[PDB]
Amino acid sequence: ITYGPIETVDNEELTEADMLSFISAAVNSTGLIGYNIKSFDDLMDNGIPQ
Amino acid sequence: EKIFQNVEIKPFLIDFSNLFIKNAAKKLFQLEEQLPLVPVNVVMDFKGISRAAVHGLSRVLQDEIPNYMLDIKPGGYKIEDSTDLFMTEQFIRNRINFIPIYAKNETLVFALRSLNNSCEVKTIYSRDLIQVAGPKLKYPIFNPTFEIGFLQPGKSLIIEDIYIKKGIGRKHAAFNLAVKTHFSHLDIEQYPTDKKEYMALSGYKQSSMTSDPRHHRLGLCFPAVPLPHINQAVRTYLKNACRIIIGRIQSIQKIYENFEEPQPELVLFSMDEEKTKAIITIKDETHTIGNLLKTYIYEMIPDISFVGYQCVPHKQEMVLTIIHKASQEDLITLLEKSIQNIIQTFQILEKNVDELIA
Amino acid sequence: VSTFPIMRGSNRCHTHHLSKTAKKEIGEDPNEPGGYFIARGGEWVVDLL
Amino acid sequence: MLIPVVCFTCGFPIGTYAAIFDKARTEYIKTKMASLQIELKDLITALGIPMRVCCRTHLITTLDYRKYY
Amino acid sequence: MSSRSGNKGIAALALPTSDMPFTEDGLQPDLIVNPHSHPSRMTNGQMIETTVGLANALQGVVTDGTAFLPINVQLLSERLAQEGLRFNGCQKMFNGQTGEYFDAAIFIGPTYHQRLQKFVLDDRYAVASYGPTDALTGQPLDGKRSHGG
Amino acid sequence: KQITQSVHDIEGLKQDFRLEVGDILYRDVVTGDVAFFNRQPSLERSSIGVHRIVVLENPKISTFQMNVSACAWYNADFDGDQMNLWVPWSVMSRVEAELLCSVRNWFISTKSSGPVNGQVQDSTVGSFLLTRTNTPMGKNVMNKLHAMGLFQTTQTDPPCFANYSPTDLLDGKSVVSMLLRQTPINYQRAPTWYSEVYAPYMHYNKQDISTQIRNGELIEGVLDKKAVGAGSSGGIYHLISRRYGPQQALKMIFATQQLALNYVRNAGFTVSTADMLLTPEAHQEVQEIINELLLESEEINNRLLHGDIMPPIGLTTHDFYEKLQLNALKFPDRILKPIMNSINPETNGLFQMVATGAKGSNPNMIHIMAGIGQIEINTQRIQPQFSFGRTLVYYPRFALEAQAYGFICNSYIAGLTSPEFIFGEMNGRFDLINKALSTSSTGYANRKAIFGLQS
Amino acid sequence: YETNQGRQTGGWYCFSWPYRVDMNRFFQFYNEMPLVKTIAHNYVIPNGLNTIVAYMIYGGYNQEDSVIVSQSFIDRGGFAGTFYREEKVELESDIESFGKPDPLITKNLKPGANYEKLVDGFVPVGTVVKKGDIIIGKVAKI
Amino acid sequence: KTSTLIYLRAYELFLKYLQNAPNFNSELAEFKTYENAYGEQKALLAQQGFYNIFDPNTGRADQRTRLFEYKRLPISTLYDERGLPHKWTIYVYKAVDSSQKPAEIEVTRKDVIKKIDNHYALADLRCSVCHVLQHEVGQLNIKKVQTALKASLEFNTFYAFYESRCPKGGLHDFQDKKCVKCGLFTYIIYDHLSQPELVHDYYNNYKDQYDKEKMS
Numbered sequence A: 001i002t003y004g005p006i007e008t009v010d011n012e013e014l015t016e017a018d019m020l021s022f023i024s025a026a027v028n029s030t031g032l033i034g035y036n037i038k039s040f041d042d043l044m045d046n047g048i049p050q
Numbered sequence B: 001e002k003i004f005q006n007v008e009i010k011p012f013l014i015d016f017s018n019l020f021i022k023n024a025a026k027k028l029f030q031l032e033e034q035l036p037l038v039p040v041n042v043v044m045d046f047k048g049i050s051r052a053a054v055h056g057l058s059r060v061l062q063d064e065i066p067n068y069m070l071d072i073k074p075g076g077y078k079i080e081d082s083t084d085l086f087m088t089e090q091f092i093r094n095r096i097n098f099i100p101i102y103a104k105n106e107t108l109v110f111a112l113r114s115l116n117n118s119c120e121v122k123t124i125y126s127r128d129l130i131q132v133a134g135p136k137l138k139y140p141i142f143n144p145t146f147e148i149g150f151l152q153p154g155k156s157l158i159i160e161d162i163y164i165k166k167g168i169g170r171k172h173a174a175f176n177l178a179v180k181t182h183f184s185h186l187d188i189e190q191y192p193t194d195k196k197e198y199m200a201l202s203g204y205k206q207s208s209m210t211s212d213p214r215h216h217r218l219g220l221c222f223p224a225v226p227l228p229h230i231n232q233a234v235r236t237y238l239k240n241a242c243r244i245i246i247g248r249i250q251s252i253q254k255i256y257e258n259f260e261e262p263q264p265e266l267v268l269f270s271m272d273e274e275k276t277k278a279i280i281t282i283k284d285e286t287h288t289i290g291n292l293l294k295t296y297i298y299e300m301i302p303d304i305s306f307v308g309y310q311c312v313p314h315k316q317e318m319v320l321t322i323i324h325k326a327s328q329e330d331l332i333t334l335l336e337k338s339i340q341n342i343i344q345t346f347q348i349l350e351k352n353v354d355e356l357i358a
Numbered sequence C: 001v002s003t004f005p006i007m008r009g010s011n012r013c014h015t016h017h018l019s020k021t022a023k024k025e026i027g028e029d030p031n032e033p034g035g036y037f038i039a040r041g042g043e044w045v046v047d048l049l
Numbered sequence D: 001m002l003i004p005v006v007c008f009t010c011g012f013p014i015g016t017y018a019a020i021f022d023k024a025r026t027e028y029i030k031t032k033m034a035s036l037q038i039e040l041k042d043l044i045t046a047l048g049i050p051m052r053v054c055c056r057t058h059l060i061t062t063l064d065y066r067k068y069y
Numbered sequence E: 001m002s003s004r005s006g007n008k009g010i011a012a013l014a015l016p017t018s019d020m021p022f023t024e025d026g027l028q029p030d031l032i033v034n035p036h037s038h039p040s041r042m043t044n045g046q047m048i049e050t051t052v053g054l055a056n057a058l059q060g061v062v063t064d065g066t067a068f069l070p071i072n073v074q075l076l077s078e079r080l081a082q083e084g085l086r087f088n089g090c091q092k093m094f095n096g097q098t099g100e101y102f103d104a105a106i107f108i109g110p111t112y113h114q115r116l117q118k119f120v121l122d123d124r125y126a127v128a129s130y131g132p133t134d135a136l137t138g139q140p141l142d143g144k145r146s147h148g149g
Numbered sequence F: 001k002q003i004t005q006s007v008h009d010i011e012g013l014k015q016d017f018r019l020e021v022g023d024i025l026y027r028d029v030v031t032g033d034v035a036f037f038n039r040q041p042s043l044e045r046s047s048i049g050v051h052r053i054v055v056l057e058n059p060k061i062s063t064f065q066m067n068v069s070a071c072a073w074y075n076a077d078f079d080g081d082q083m084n085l086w087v088p089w090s091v092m093s094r095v096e097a098e099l100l101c102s103v104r105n106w107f108i109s110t111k112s113s114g115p116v117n118g119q120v121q122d123s124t125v126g127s128f129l130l131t132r133t134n135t136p137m138g139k140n141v142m143n144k145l146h147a148m149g150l151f152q153t154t155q156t157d158p159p160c161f162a163n164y165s166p167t168d169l170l171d172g173k174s175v176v177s178m179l180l181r182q183t184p185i186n187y188q189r190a191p192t193w194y195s196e197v198y199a200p201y202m203h204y205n206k207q208d209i210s211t212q213i214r215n216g217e218l219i220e221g222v223l224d225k226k227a228v229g230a231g232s233s234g235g236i237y238h239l240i241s242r243r244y245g246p247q248q249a250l251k252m253i254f255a256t257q258q259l260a261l262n263y264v265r266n267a268g269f270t271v272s273t274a275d276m277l278l279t280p281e282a283h284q285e286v287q288e289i290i291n292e293l294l295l296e297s298e299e300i301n302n303r304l305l306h307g308d309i310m311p312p313i314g315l316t317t318h319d320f321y322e323k324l325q326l327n328a329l330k331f332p333d334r335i336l337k338p339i340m341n342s343i344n345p346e347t348n349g350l351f352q353m354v355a356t357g358a359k360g361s362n363p364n365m366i367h368i369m370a371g372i373g374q375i376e377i378n379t380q381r382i383q384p385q386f387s388f389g390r391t392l393v394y395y396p397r398f399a400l401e402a403q404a405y406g407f408i409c410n411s412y413i414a415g416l417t418s419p420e421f422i423f424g425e426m427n428g429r430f431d432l433i434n435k436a437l438s439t440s441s442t443g444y445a446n447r448k449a450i451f452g453l454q455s
Numbered sequence G: 001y002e003t004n005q006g007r008q009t010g011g012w013y014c015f016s017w018p019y020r021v022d023m024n025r026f027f028q029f030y031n032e033m034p035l036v037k038t039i040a041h042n043y044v045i046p047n048g049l050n051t052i053v054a055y056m057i058y059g060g061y062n063q064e065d066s067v068i069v070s071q072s073f074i075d076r077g078g079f080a081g082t083f084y085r086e087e088k089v090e091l092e093s094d095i096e097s098f099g100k101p102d103p104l105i106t107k108n109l110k111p112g113a114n115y116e117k118l119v120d121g122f123v124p125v126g127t128v129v130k131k132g133d134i135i136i137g138k139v140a141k142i
Numbered sequence H: 001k002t003s004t005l006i007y008l009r010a011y012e013l014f015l016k017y018l019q020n021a022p023n024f025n026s027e028l029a030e031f032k033t034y035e036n037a038y039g040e041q042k043a044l045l046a047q048q049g050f051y052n053i054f055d056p057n058t059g060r061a062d063q064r065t066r067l068f069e070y071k072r073l074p075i076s077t078l079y080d081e082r083g084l085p086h087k088w089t090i091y092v093y094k095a096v097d098s099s100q101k102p103a104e105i106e107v108t109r110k111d112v113i114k115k116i117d118n119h120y121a122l123a124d125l126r127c128s129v130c131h132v133l134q135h136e137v138g139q140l141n142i143k144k145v146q147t148a149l150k151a152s153l154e155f156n157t158f159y160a161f162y163e164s165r166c167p168k169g170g171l172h173d174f175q176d177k178k179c180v181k182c183g184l185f186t187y188i189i190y191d192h193l194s195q196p197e198l199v200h201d202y203y204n205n206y207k208d209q210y211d212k213e214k215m216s
Ligand SMILES: [Mg+2]
Pocket: F076, F077, F078, F079, F080, F081
């Protein structure tokens, strides 16, 4: 799965307000709460029976 | 010469040329013209009058002038059991208290009876304040576009006694009439403040400690006057401010003329060097009156030993101290003449107000 | 013979997949995520130990 | 819960034009659209709100409880 | 009350709108913050937020002031100047009590302020000479909650 | 009722119509009553003092209101502090409270033998502004009406202005003399406004850099923290206490405080974001100074690379290398040159607060404007705690740049970067930990010391 | 310090507040997005108001981190809201019940209490209660 | 009419949930996307764009910063052509007007308030050791500065190493052998010249052999 060469990626216009989009993507992925709800769901499903 | 020179009355109007504004207006309010009550910016020019008098007029028009507001009679807000759980009585009361009203009658009583028989959140607008009291409103006293609280689906809100209350804005800010938009002295030169070397300064060339301006431009905005009757409303507001100032000054004058008779507002001591100390203590008095008295006593007695006032935030009173190289009755008649000067200045202001606006 | 406390918002909570409007009219917070427990009249959060 | 009936700082009745401003601003979003890519100076001036720092501050920033509930 | 830069403040004054200081354009504050709160606490974020908010209110915009985003105070001041205000956010201010303009231009602008949930009405307590007493030691009970102590 | 040896509530005394001699009446506290005022923790002797009650009749007020200069007794501020207040009712306690425990006895610190109270913040700079020679507008004068207005709130008997015409200009030092005349003292000392570190830049007025008071007549100089500040031994309030008792010192603290505050009610004072902003030329010089520091640090590193570091006998090479570096990244005295080039001292609010001692110091001005510099934790740089030889994930292992070990190059007004903020937070938290230790650690020592010595 | 104070700030503490009976909960009516917002406000609603503040010396009433507040800004709704408290009591056994304690039997009535304004043992909704008043009236030895 | 549809259906689904509907799993899952579409409409009524301050030079988000940049400096800004650090303690002033006869005074920090007033303005500082002004440091020859520092570093390290040690060994820094001096203060003063040039060359081999032993 070789990616394109790094000499061709255009990043000169990449600002830090653009990196705020990456931060928002990370927060959307985690959900900001989701880990404990998912841990409790995993408890109820697999851990308590186990 | 004339003290209050020509006035500039320019109401604030909705610019329907903007497509979004017109579209929204017709979409939610079905509004195509100017609202019945509009804010008016009144800019005034004052010449040959001390800064204390102009600022006192401004302060009176701001909060020391009696004004009307819509309040809910206790027990008016039906607690009930269907009313919207979010629209608390405190919240709706705060919304209604601050709806500017140009009420010429106090007997008007309104009722709010809004039901949300639908699945959407229904917003209660000021047009929902129906009136059941005495005279039918020939002209509305408030704009019908004010957002009062919203109703959740299936919820209602019934407020049955919304009456008009009288008060001054100093005690409760819901009575504040005029908002400040301009104040400058025209007889003091100004630096170019966009420059770097004068950007940290006020701009006036004379230091405030050593400046005595007599030419001022005062700008005030009134929040709601009837659109066809802007000039008469401005006239009434300014004349009532002058009347209020004159009346309070005359209240001081009575204390002055009762100087031989005992009274706890005024005391007099002849201290050491023929000097007589007069301390005038008046409760619930503002900086307007004290500043007027200090400035005009100082103008009438340039060689005074000491004149000063203090309205300490606590003890809620104005205490004015005069010390002068004169006997008690000579000092009293000087102070009486200074009060007559204040009355003369504000009567001339009312005369100019009548002459100008019309 | 037992009951296990159920964290609000978990898959065994009655508001796990309910609509936000249903949560609104059921007395719950539509925007809150959950993650707490309701025990003897008080809401408790199990922190990250 | 709503745009205040009058500006908190000075008392200018921004609540008069609050309802119009809300939907005018919404329609202005739909032609420009992650916070606030807009400039609302023209919309506010058109309503008659003067160039007051306070009134514009409280008009464009006050949260509405209907948007969040 | 507190600012987002962490400057707590207990409110001790209630001035009417006529006693509040005001600028030439009529703008007056809601809070009056002592300038000495800055130099030893070094809460420059509050001042920069005040500058940017002054520029934002006139433009009708809401800027993102997240930490570590690029910031140039010189260019934000130039933006203030381009907005019609001064290079600094200061204005010609008049004393509300006496109508006298201040000699110095006063830095007034919007700052986001938070009401901390520490109410004086909850915290204040006064007790008389008698009330509930501890059965063992005969002393008053402990604290406000017990209605004595 | 002594006749019944019982206490009656006031609702059931309609038949009384009078009180007999020997009755005890429990009456409401009035203005002028003595009250004990105490802040916990009560660490110093002045931690409990007696104040004259001033009942505030406004029902919307529920706080205890005190003059700001009084807070030095209790080490208090108004950020949310709560202090106990009880009003003595017993005659023996009331006699005691006003005669023995009144705050006038705690004006002079038992610990330091100097005054406790004075002007703080708003008045320390207010006294300087009132008493300085030249304002940016011109000479610091006021007409008769505004000189009179300075004495409106002093609560003392106002002086005589009959000798002044309405157009007469009164100097700032004139009005202070008419207040200091009631307690005439002799004071001659260099003010806090004049500093050696500032002198090469800025043009000091020769009538401001020598505060002399002869028999209560301020004849030259400015009044700042050295003269009127709180805790300033030998200050004017300490001298007033020595000659005329500590009660007169407290009155002159309040009278001068109102005189200063009323002056700023017309002069006005502020701090702006541009007060802490450097000019582009000076900011180009601050970088040049910092690059000189980093050049010396790299010169030390280049010695380390070639093995030129020979530690002194008793120190390891790493100990000597760290010692050399901490000397290399020390801000020179010339860092004040770009700051003073960008500062108008007559109008700069931040500088005046610092230079007059109202609040802040030179490091605060340098940190805000010039640069934070090296971050020192226990007199050493940031230790490599992230990994073996790494201080942070943002720096390579065995990095030799000074930035890797806490040297912050930016200033606060410029905005720290992500690793500079992390290093600053390590110092910031380490100061928060020390405070929390300080309260508990001294508590054990204070109680042990009390019991050993109390008898 | 802000991290500490941000989590104590008054605001919309819960969107379902009318359905909850909570103790020491403050619901602030008016909230505003900061003019200078940050990324955090994309996920949590803002708590507070955009207050016009003046960094000035005004009468010396703001020394030592005090604040001078416009009374008008307070009256208009600035940082105003509702503070809620709960009063929950429970019956010990069948020996207790809710109801107005009849003054004839009494035998334990509180000294100087009101005992009026009770309907079916509870104060009716919308009724102001002062310090001396009795709420949720309860009796025993029935 | 999405408001009445979203509300009534949510209640019916909720009522179906309590009655244990057979299709409730699929009917609710489809409603989640129905509510999510309805959710964005409310989010539109809340959010108002993206925004950033635009740089005129680059019409994207403004990235200009007053931050610090490294910019390695020449070594002459630190040490003079002899090898000693600069001491910027002398303050030079220039008159604001040409009519002023002196027009320049070089005074130390203490003398500033004595001799300098508003009629003069501060100029660049001067090093009290090598007498060079600050803005003219470029005149100093770098290659001469470096070769002087290498001798200054070598001699300083030599004497720092031999602060107590003797090149012939055994302290004896009073007079013996060549441990301390050949007369005068030649061991620390470094400006008497040609005494360090000989003595350091006498024991240069010792310096080389000890440095490598230490660096092991
Ligand atoms: Mg404190």
